[PDB]
């Protein structure tokens, strides 16, 4: 599935893994994907999130409250949570339905919203960003 990703989408997932590592987390969850979308900085997802007032520090703060720093450094390669796998699979489906044969940062964010149930979704709502508004912003920046 990674072979469909744009270079900047690949960067999102790489940064998600680095954020999980920094937090001493044992899985790449949806919240790490959200942090990766922000860290990537330049894509439609990052720009959408900046527009909606969703900051790297706000998300990190929420993740610290909900999950907390782990005590032991994990390995270089961290597995995805089931929910994060689902998000990636849905990102593909978003792209396909919109007529794209590639997965960009926009599609990863749309997939995160489509899944809508995991830690990232909980954090977005806690930070004042209803999922529906997030999708509209993405679609808007795309149009």
């Amino acid at each position: 599935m990674f072979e469909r990703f744009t270079d900047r989408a690949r960067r999102v997932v790489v940064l998600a893994q680095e954020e999980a590592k920094m937090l001493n987390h044992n899985y790449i969850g949806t919240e790490h994907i959200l942090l990766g979308l922000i860290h990537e900085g330049e894509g439609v997802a990052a720009k959408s999130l900046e527009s909606l007032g969703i900051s790297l520090e706000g998300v990190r703060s929420q993740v610290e409250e909900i999950i907390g720093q782990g005590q032991q450094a994990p390995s270089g390669h961290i597995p995805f949570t089931p929910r994060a796998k689902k998000v990636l699979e849905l990102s593909l489906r978003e792209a396909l339905q919109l007529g794209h044969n590639y997965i960009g940062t926009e599609h990863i964010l749309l997939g995160l919203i489509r899944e809508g149930e995991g830690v990232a979704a909980q954090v977005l709502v806690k930070l004042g960003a209803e999922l529906t508004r997030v999708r509209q912003q993405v679609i808007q920046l795309l149009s």
């Binding site: 990674f2 997932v13 790489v14 893994q17 790449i28 390669h77 597995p79 995805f80 796998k85």
Partner: peptide, 16 residues
Amino acid sequence: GLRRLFADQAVGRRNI
């Protein structure tokens, strides 16, 4: 990869 056992090239883990 999208599973568990050993390191994918870039991100995640995979099984045999």
